[PDB]
Amino acid sequence: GQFGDIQSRTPESKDVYANTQLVLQRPAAGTVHVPYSQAPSGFKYWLKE
Amino acid sequence: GQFGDIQSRTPESKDVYANTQLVLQRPAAGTVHVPYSQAPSGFKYWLKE
Amino acid sequence: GQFGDIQSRTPESKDVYANTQLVLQRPAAGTVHVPYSQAPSGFKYWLKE
Amino acid sequence: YKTVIPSPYVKCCGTAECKDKNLPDYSCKVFTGVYPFMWGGAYCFCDAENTQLSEAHVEKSESCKTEFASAYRAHTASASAKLRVLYQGNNITVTAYA
Amino acid sequence: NVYKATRPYLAHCPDCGEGHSCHSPVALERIRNEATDGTLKIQVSLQIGIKTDDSHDWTKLRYMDNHMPADAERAGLFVRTSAPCTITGTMGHFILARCPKGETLTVGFTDSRKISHSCTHPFHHDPPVIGREKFHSRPQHGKELPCSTYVQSTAATTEEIEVHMPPDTPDRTLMSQQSGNVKITVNGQTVRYKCNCGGSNEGLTTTDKVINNCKVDQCHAAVTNHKKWQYNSPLVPRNAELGDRKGKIHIPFPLANVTCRVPKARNPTVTYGKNQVIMLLYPDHPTLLSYRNMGEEPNYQEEWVMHKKEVVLTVPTEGLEVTWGNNEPYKYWPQM
Amino acid sequence: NVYKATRPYLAHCPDCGEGHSCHSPVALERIRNEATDGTLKIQVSLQIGIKTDDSHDWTKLRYMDNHMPADAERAGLFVRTSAPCTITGTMGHFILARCPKGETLTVGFTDSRKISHSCTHPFHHDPPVIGREKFHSRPQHGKELPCSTYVQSTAATTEEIEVHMPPDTPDRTLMSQQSGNVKITVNGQTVRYKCNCGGSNEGLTTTDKVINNCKVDQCHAAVTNHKKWQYNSPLVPRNAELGDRKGKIHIPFPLANVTCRVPKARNPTVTYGKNQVIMLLYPDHPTLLSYRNMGEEPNYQEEWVMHKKEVVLTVPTEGLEVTWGNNEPYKYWPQL
């Protein structure tokens, strides 16, 4: 959720660092979907604050 | 205007208690209507506050 | 921008006093228009405040 | 960031198993007793013997080439100056490193 | 016609109309708003510009209609927040639109049977403040500032997605009680069946099948898609007899850096005093006011001016720099 | 018939649709909002209620369509801010409309070829509520309050606009690049031309002309018709062989002070106490509450009541006067 939640060497780099606190949740009754809990983009938040 | 402006024994009860401060007003020029001044529903106000 | 930005003797009077801070601006590229910077009506502002 | 999530593996009348993958923020979970529904009815035959494999990982978004912020470490600075000189009744422009 | 192999599918919706949730063929997936100009990249359940036979036709739309994909009209497609939106690009699952200030995004269309389906999602739309002024309507001529938007070029370049085989869809309307036997009506589709009764009780049929001495409740069928291609979606299960076998297709509407046109706030009534400056700010739209000292201690202060305001700012010996919206910074220096 | 010398024309627009600027036949000129009731006096580029042959027809509209004026439908005409507006008068360039709260004004119509053109201008609309109650429907009988509106008297009095001559109407569609030469297609009209290139580079032609070895950008043409009149528009250029030569015509629908019937806030639940008054305020719309003492020290206090509120006010020996919205001031006296 902070500035640096996703870290890469260059904009064209292959390997990336990621700390976003991603956890999968159980799907709804009779529903095919992948529900998840994840902290929003730190870069998008920083661009505002 | 407060909680208890209308009091009844059960939701299906016959006799009811009412203190709403209802006063009739004089109708408008050449108009057929029953204008009145009354304190709003105490139950509806309580449901919000 | 204040009460009295435009002063006249009577509502039907010929001569008027005007202090509105009116300045002409350069028109937009390939556009025919008269852009200007002027303080809004003091009377219209007073009618609100 | 881009949260890359593929189609969930719904195993009808059986159990699915999570494979430990070397991917940034890789998350995996298997949910027991799932009875999912589609357009024409139930996708599975069994009532409680079905499983669903939910896998996910974090990648750089397509925008990273355009929309990005760079983290620099400033060491020392080199000064350079544009100077105007009135030499022999004429203005001359001098641009050099300070 | 890349739409020959590719196909369409169905999904779920939280609001199909009047606050009721259903399985909508115009279901909303992802609403991207990365473009600074105000362009929205909407991902939908259906496919636009492609026909059921996998052929390019800009006037046609491809949506899922109860186990089978059907054709619709491009003119019937609509996008709205609080007022209708102007569609500036359509290709497959993607729609490009410029929307006014709204709290809920609505995307809909009209089918062959003259029935309209629409999906509503809660989305706080409010084009960011590109510059220093919060205006509503865009000007034809103004200050040039760098921004980004999604272009309307359909050309197969830059961005791409992953595709593969789809799953099987359930359908009870495929089975029928023929006296004391069960008849499976295929209707030119690949159907996967399973029954409790003896004999043939499994398989993948392309022809009409009949199960002798059985009940409809003791069976279960469902359509499947193999000959066609599908996009790697996390809301659809992965193909059982397949590892990581996948394809890729180029996608329309890429992100490109353009130029946004803005305006410049009107000069404020300025009056000078003893080491102080007085400004009478009259903003038409939300305008940003910022000021700093031109010395050792700058002491930056920022505020969004919206109403009629009078500001008194102290001018030191070093100088005071004041920036009023998109206008060039005004420099002020003390005197006698 | 002042419309003998008068005529229509075209102008430019800052927003013809989806934020793109163009030359619109429904171009906005001046949006007057002097009326206190909320009526807007919109000035447009086209003419309503008149046909191309100069005849009165309320169901018809006259707009400019590529060098020549064409007829359209009155039903196709629309005005909107954030929601559609009710049109309460149409005559020539003028439209009368009552609009809800909006930030951008939009005026449009539909042509003969079934193509819709609309012009959008940024305008902060927010009429000043009349009275102390925010009602939607106007009552036939109520409280008389002073307001202002635009009357429907067509009579040539009070207000006036400046009208000038439209010398030669510029038209770039008259020139065409014929390989390496410029062809001027007259189409049965008198055209005035001028070029940078040698040979014939001036004149008033009635026949098709060709300028050898020249470019379209280095030329200029326009139709002649110094027989009709035009209104002084900033969206149309000034006549070259003319200084400040202009005429003037009286305009319909002037502003005049009238009377408006508003409503009154409902009486609150009042309960008395020891030198104090308790009021249970139930406002339907933002209602102003003000109170003062009837002695030496009045101590005026004002507040805008919007939600359910309970107010306790101290009543001195001199008396307390409370004004609740547009209702007559309630007088209260304690003792003992």
CA distances from F258 to E13, F33, F99, F136, F263 (A): 53, 16, 20, 19, 17
d(CA F225, CA F190): 8
F263 close to F131: Cβ distance less than 8 angstroms = yes
Return the sign of the alpha-carbon dihedral for residues F188, F191, F196, F201.
positive
As a whole number of Å, the CA-based R_g of chain B is 15
Read out DSSP for E286-317?
-EEEEEEESSS----EEEEE-S-EEEEEE--T
Yes or no, beta carbons of F234 and C31 under 8 Å apart: no
Q: Give the tokens for residue F137.
A: 């429907």
F59 close to F265: Cβ distance less than 8 angstroms = no
CA distances from E275 to E77, E95, E312, E334, F32 (A): 62, 57, 10, 6, 43
Instruction: Please state the separation of Cα E199 from the chain's center in Å.
Output: 50
F288 close to F305: Cβ distance less than 8 angstroms = yes
Q: Is F231 exposed, middle or buried (0-12, 13-18, 19+ CB in 10 A)?
A: buried
d(CA E179, CA E34): 60
Nearest to F21 among E83, E100, E140 (CB): E140
Spell F241-276 as b/e; 16+ CB within 10 A means b.
eeeeebeeeebbbebeeeebebbbbbbbbebeeeee
d(CA D59, CA C32): 51
Return the sign of the alpha-carbon dihedral for residues E195, E197, E203, E205.
negative
In the DSSP assignment, the letter for residue E323 is: E
Return the sign of the alpha-carbon dihedral for residues E280, E283, E286, E290.
negative
Name F140's bridge partners: none
Q: Give the tokens for residue E41.
A: 């990249």
Q: Give the tokens for residue F49.
A: 């209620």
For residue F5, give how far its alpha carbon lies from the nearest alpha carbon of chain B (Å): 51
d(CA E44, CA E51): 16
Q: Which of E36, E41, E146, E141 is nearest to E87 (CA)?
A: E41
Do D and E make contact via 3 or more CB pairs under 8 A? The reply is yes
In F, what residues contact C, Cβ < 8 A?
Answer: 12, 128, 234-237
- D10 part of contact set with chain E, CB < 8 Å: yes
Yes or no, beta carbons of F12 and C34 under 8 Å apart: no
d(CA E304, CA E133): 9
Report resolution (Å) to 1 decimal.
Answer: 5.0
- A37 part of contact set with chain E, CB < 8 Å: no
- Alpha helices by DSSP H, chain E: none
Q: Quote the Cα angle for D63-E43-E77, to 5°.
A: 135
Per-state percent for chain E, helix, strand, coil, to nearest 5: 5, 50, 45
For residue E64, give how far its alpha carbon lies from the nearest alpha carbon of chain A (Å): 17
Return the sign of the alpha-carbon dihedral for residues F17, F23, F25, F26.
positive
Q: Is E143 exposed, middle or buried (0-12, 13-18, 19+ CB in 10 A)?
A: middle
Residue with tokens 């030469």: F181
Q: Give the tokens for residue C39.
A: 């303080």
**Chain F residues near residue E100 by CB distance under 8 angstroms:** 82
Method: cryo-EM
d(CA E291, CA E306): 17
Do F and B make contact via 3 or more CB pairs under 8 A? The reply is yes
CB-based contacts of E21-27 (< 8 A; 24+ apart in sequence): E23/D39, E24/E117, E24/E118, E24/E119, E25/E63, E25/E64, E25/E65, E25/E117, E26/E63, E26/E107, E26/E108, E26/E109, E26/E117, E26/E118, E26/E119, E27/E119
For residue C17, give how far its alpha carbon lies from the nearest alpha carbon of chain F (Å): 22
F195 close to F211: Cβ distance less than 8 angstroms = yes
**Chain B residues near residue F308 by CB distance under 8 angstroms:** 40, 45, 48-49
Residues 6+ apart with CB under 8 A from B14: none
Nearest to E140 among F15, F83, F124 (CB): F15
SS3 state of residue A44: helix
F212 close to F246: Cβ distance less than 8 angstroms = no
d(CA F33, CA F102): 13
Q: Which amino acid is residue F303, in one-letter code? A: E
- D79 part of contact set with chain A, CB < 8 Å: no
Residue with tokens 């001046």: F30
Per-state percent for chain B, helix, strand, coil, to nearest 5: 10, 20, 70
Q: Which of F256, F24, F244 is nearest to F121 (CA)?
A: F24
d(CA E8, CA E45): 7
Element (H, E) at F191: strand F191-195
- The DSSP bridge pattern shows strands D27-32 and D51-59 to be antiparallel
d(CA F333, CA F336): 10
d(CA F221, CA F244): 23
Q: What does the longest C-alpha to C-alpha distance in chain F come to?
A: 108
How many angstroms separate the first and last alpha carbons of chain D?
42
Q: Is E45 exposed, middle or buried (0-12, 13-18, 19+ CB in 10 A)?
A: buried
d(CA E160, CA E155): 12
d(CA F212, CA E290): 60
As a whole number of Å, the CA-based R_g of chain E is 30
- A32 part of contact set with chain E, CB < 8 Å: yes
Closest residue of chain B to F278, computed from CA coordinates: B1
Yes or no, beta carbons of F141 and B29 under 8 Å apart: yes
In this structure, the dihedral spanned by the alpha carbons of residues E113, E66, E109 and D3, taken in order and rounded to 10 degrees, is 180
Q: Which of E10, E93, E7 is nearest to E44 (CA)?
A: E93
E50 close to E3: Cβ distance less than 8 angstroms = yes
